[PDB]
Design a protein around this ligand. Structure first.
Ligand SMILES: Cc1cc2nc3c(=O)[nH]c(=O)nc-3n(CCCNC(=O)O)c2cc1C
Ligand SMILES: Cc1cc2nc3c(=O)[nH]c(=O)nc-3n(CCCNC(=O)O)c2cc1C
Ligand SMILES: Cc1cc2nc3c(=O)[nH]c(=O)nc-3n(CCCNC(=O)O)c2cc1C
Ligand SMILES: Cc1cc2nc3c(=O)[nH]c(=O)nc-3n(CCCNC(=O)O)c2cc1C
Ligand SMILES: Cc1cc2nc3c(=O)[nH]c(=O)nc-3n(CCCNC(=O)O)c2cc1C
Ligand SMILES: Cc1cc2nc3c(=O)[nH]c(=O)nc-3n(CCCNC(=O)O)c2cc1C
Ligand SMILES: Cc1cc2nc3c(=O)[nH]c(=O)nc-3n(CCCNC(=O)O)c2cc1C
Ligand SMILES: Cc1cc2nc3c(=O)[nH]c(=O)nc-3n(CCCNC(=O)O)c2cc1C
Ligand SMILES: Cc1cc2nc3c(=O)[nH]c(=O)nc-3n(CCCNC(=O)O)c2cc1C
Ligand SMILES: Cc1cc2nc3c(=O)[nH]c(=O)nc-3n(CCCNC(=O)O)c2cc1C
Ligand SMILES: Cc1cc2nc3c(=O)[nH]c(=O)nc-3n(CCCNC(=O)O)c2cc1C
Ligand SMILES: Cc1cc2nc3c(=O)[nH]c(=O)nc-3n(CCCNC(=O)O)c2cc1C
Ligand SMILES: [Cl-]
Ligand SMILES: [Cl-]
Ligand SMILES: [Cl-]
Ligand SMILES: [Cl-]
Ligand SMILES: [Mg+2]
Ligand SMILES: [Mg+2]
Ligand SMILES: [Mg+2]
Ligand SMILES: [Mg+2]
Ligand SMILES: [Mg+2]
Ligand SMILES: [Mg+2]
Ligand SMILES: [Mg+2]
Ligand SMILES: [Mg+2]
Ligand SMILES: [Mg+2]
Ligand SMILES: [Mg+2]
Ligand SMILES: [Mg+2]
Ligand SMILES: [Mg+2]
Ligand code: NA
Ligand code: NA
Ligand code: NA
Ligand code: NA
Ligand code: NA
Ligand code: NA
Ligand code: NA
Ligand code: NA
Ligand code: NA
Ligand code: NA
Ligand code: NA
Ligand code: NA
Ligand code: NA
Ligand code: NA
Ligand code: NA
Ligand code: NA
Lengths: 62, 62, 62, 62, 62, 62, 62, 62, 62, 62, 62, 62
């Protein structure tokens, strides 16, 4: 059985690095992370631009 | 990194109060709740009407 | 077996009351109404504002 | 011909009043506003809760 | 309040049995499981075919 | 001209048999049923599991 | 309250005339038809081409 | 950079001519109109039928 | 088994004729074309307007 | 690089077997088939019922 | 109240830089730009590749 | 007439380079490639991360 968590990664560099920010957090706290699907992307526009990529990160349960 | 939980709040008064029911539960159990996005709304029709609002409630991890 | 009818309720007060307007019409004419799912919401803007909530109203056949 | 603007209204009371906040802004600046369609709803969760309703507000050109 | 987890069940027999695989895992670890909604279905095609059914499994919190 | 009714069939065996439950009800009450399109699938989880398949069932008018 | 029926009109001439085929059927059998929304379009390709336009046709109840 | 405006053209003849009604309005008021994407189609059913086609009309900024 | 190809037909006359442009190309090169489903429509706006209709054209394999 | 073909499998038994009908056709004609994603399901209702499952079948190019 | 404009940024380097191209144009002409949501991405394939990212860019009115 | 193929490009560097991986494969085997539309993005998480971008790559037939 796989389960997915819905995470939004951030980066001041690019949408790819914001996806990796989420995946790095998932791998810090979960075992058997196996893939991620991008569900939304956006940019927070303040003092700097922060690219955000929301991913469903799938991991295998057990 | 933000994470979202998918909660359905209920109310016998209105869709806004059913969104707040979910958010109040998230704030009981999670720190750093920052926003909610409505994903579905419906009404359970029994002895009384129960308005339901499903929200993805985002909180900042750490 | 359940069947759904696609109704748009109206109210000059709120989206929740326009959902209830549709459900009240369904319960006038159908037996065994059991739930409603909101599919669209809008506002007709004329002499007054009329909030509209479109619902699929499910009822059990028999 | 109708044209739509994509506005997000806010309210600390309810999703219906946040839709009306957007419509009131459209009617301040545009003539012949004729309807609004809700496209998204959410809640900003800070010191207080601010309900937000995003609407495409249609007005007739001429 | 209900909460949903996003699980992908697997089966080498059918999409219905892969939905039940997810639900059986949810019932192993959560109380008050009340319904599941199918969100995606697919087949992993290797040495054998593994049917997969992804479900949001809802359970009542408390 | 074809018209569609939105029915949810149920079965304690499988999603295919819950689609057939809806179609059997449509054929009991309507003439010239010609096809069905699956629009949603889910499982009610109580004393037993009840698989549900919602279909738009098309029939030719006349 | 408005209710919608889901009809597929046909024409061997064009998608506009297949929408009108559905609307003409609705007006034959229902009072107070007020608008139609196109939901799908397609072409049946046999001895001749038959353009099809599926519409939700709204009528006011009473 | 391109920008899109969301316009609904009307015609008593056909959906193609209602798309052209919107595009003709865009070309009256904007320079460098380059394409349009159909996003919705419908028919207003009153004394006469008025076909409507909503388009995002893209134009190049500068 | 049916297979679909994703084609965009063009016409300087109408969206129906741009669907037929795609279907005519499919019938030039494939046997047993049986139906087409419209998936997108748009207009290229240059020296002239070119209406485009994208269709999934289904044909039976064998 | 993976490429997907859009196939509709059929079966008089079940939606799972109609997915396998498509996959069996893909494996007859393509090398390195690796997965399939269900995109639509329906039932053709004639002398018998024919369950149909449309899948995007992915295969690795080379 | 926030309003969004629908802009397509371009870059010959990457999808992130094409999002920034749109945002830079919005900040040239609008005050109080606060966020952008990616709605579509594509690549124009001519003499060179031009990555395009379409964003709804939100700004606060006043 | 344009036709689209549905390809998933891969890269261990970024989503933009995985889109270019698909486009480079299309240009190896097809003439008159003219644009690509991103339809899905994801990351395969194994020994290394492999970013994947699925594109519909359009080419002009003739
Ligand atoms: C993708 C994205 C979506 C957002 N949507 C909203 C929104 O819907 N409402 C709101 O008050 N603030 C929002 N915000 C917050 C704006 C806060 N201010 C800022 O970024 O300068 C959003 C931010 C991001 C990055
Ligand atoms: C939004 C909403 C959706 C529902 N969908 C279903 C459903 O798909 N199937 C079912 O057996 N019961 C359902 N139910 C449960 C009906 C249970 N009875 C009742 O509300 O009187 C649903 C209830 C709600 C509020
Ligand atoms: C949600 C909503 C959607 C509408 N869409 C349309 C529409 O697409 N076209 C049209 O002529 N009139 C429309 N109308 C009717 C405008 C009629 N005039 C008015 O409300 O002052 C719509 C009305 C509502 C409430
Ligand atoms: C509907 C809604 C969506 C939002 N989405 C985002 C978002 O995607 N990213 C972000 O940094 N901040 C967001 N925000 C901003 C969070 C800012 N903080 C706060 O509300 O306490 C969003 C706010 C709202 C109301
Ligand atoms: C529904 C489904 C979707 C998949 N999507 C992908 C995918 O997008 N990319 C990838 O490298 N592998 C995938 N895979 C993994 C292919 C691994 N190999 C195999 O199944 O023989 C997917 C598998 C399944 C069952
Ligand atoms: C597909 C499906 C969707 C449902 N959605 C809801 C729902 O949104 N809210 C609710 O109160 N009950 C629901 N229910 C009813 C739960 C009633 N209890 C039970 O099944 O043990 C749903 C049931 C089904 C089968
Ligand atoms: C829009 C459209 C969709 C169709 N989809 C299907 C379909 O999914 N399966 C099937 O067996 N036949 C279909 N058909 C029926 C093909 C019957 N034969 C024919 O048109 O020569 C469809 C027909 C139309 C017009
Ligand atoms: C596509 C379309 C959508 C519409 N949707 C609505 C609607 O949602 N609510 C409403 O009061 N009136 C509507 N109307 C207005 C009906 C006004 N009366 C009429 O057309 O005779 C709509 C009109 C059109 C053309
Ligand atoms: C439906 C449609 C969509 C289009 N989308 C795009 C697009 O997203 N980006 C771009 O550079 N050019 C586009 N184009 C090309 C504009 C080329 N110039 C012209 O039509 O005068 C599109 C054209 C059409 C017909
Ligand atoms: C899923 C499915 C969708 C279909 N959609 C259509 C359709 O949109 N129009 C049409 O003329 N025939 C259709 N058909 C064909 C009906 C042909 N007759 C029959 O099945 O007895 C469809 C068939 C299937 C299985
Ligand atoms: C994302 C994207 C979408 C496009 N869609 C279309 C389209 O639908 N029709 C058309 O004639 N040209 C198009 N074009 C224009 C092709 C113009 N030629 C070229 O890019 O070499 C599109 C271009 C882009 C970048
Ligand atoms: C976007 C993406 C989607 C995937 N979806 C699935 C999936 O739905 N089921 C499965 O068994 N494997 C999958 N996989 C395969 C996991 C194989 N293992 C791995 O990547 O370590 C997917 C892979 C990718 C990149
Ligand atoms: Cl989710
Ligand atoms: Cl419906
Ligand atoms: Cl828009
Ligand atoms: Cl496709
Ligand atoms: Mg930096
Ligand atoms: Mg009360
Ligand atoms: Mg009042
Ligand atoms: Mg207050
Ligand atoms: Mg076995
Ligand atoms: Mg049994
Ligand atoms: Mg003729
Ligand atoms: Mg006339
Ligand atoms: Mg001409
Ligand atoms: Mg049999
Ligand atoms: Mg360069
Ligand atoms: Mg590297
Ligand atoms: Na989730
Ligand atoms: Na988002
Ligand atoms: Na729901
Ligand atoms: Na219906
Ligand atoms: Na509507
Ligand atoms: Na939003
Ligand atoms: Na999936
Ligand atoms: Na459902
Ligand atoms: Na259809
Ligand atoms: Na807009
Ligand atoms: Na519309
Ligand atoms: Na398109
Ligand atoms: Na289909
Ligand atoms: Na686009
Ligand atoms: Na395809
Ligand atoms: Na995918």
């Amino acid at each position: 059985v796989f389960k997915k968590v819905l995470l939004t990664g951030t980066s001041e560099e690019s949408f790819t690095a914001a996806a990796d920010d989420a995946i790095d957090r998932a791998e810090d706290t979960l075992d058997n992370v196996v893939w991620a699907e991008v569900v939304d992307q956006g940019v927070a526009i303040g003092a700097v631009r922060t690219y955000q990529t929301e991913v469903q990160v799938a991991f295998e349960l057990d």
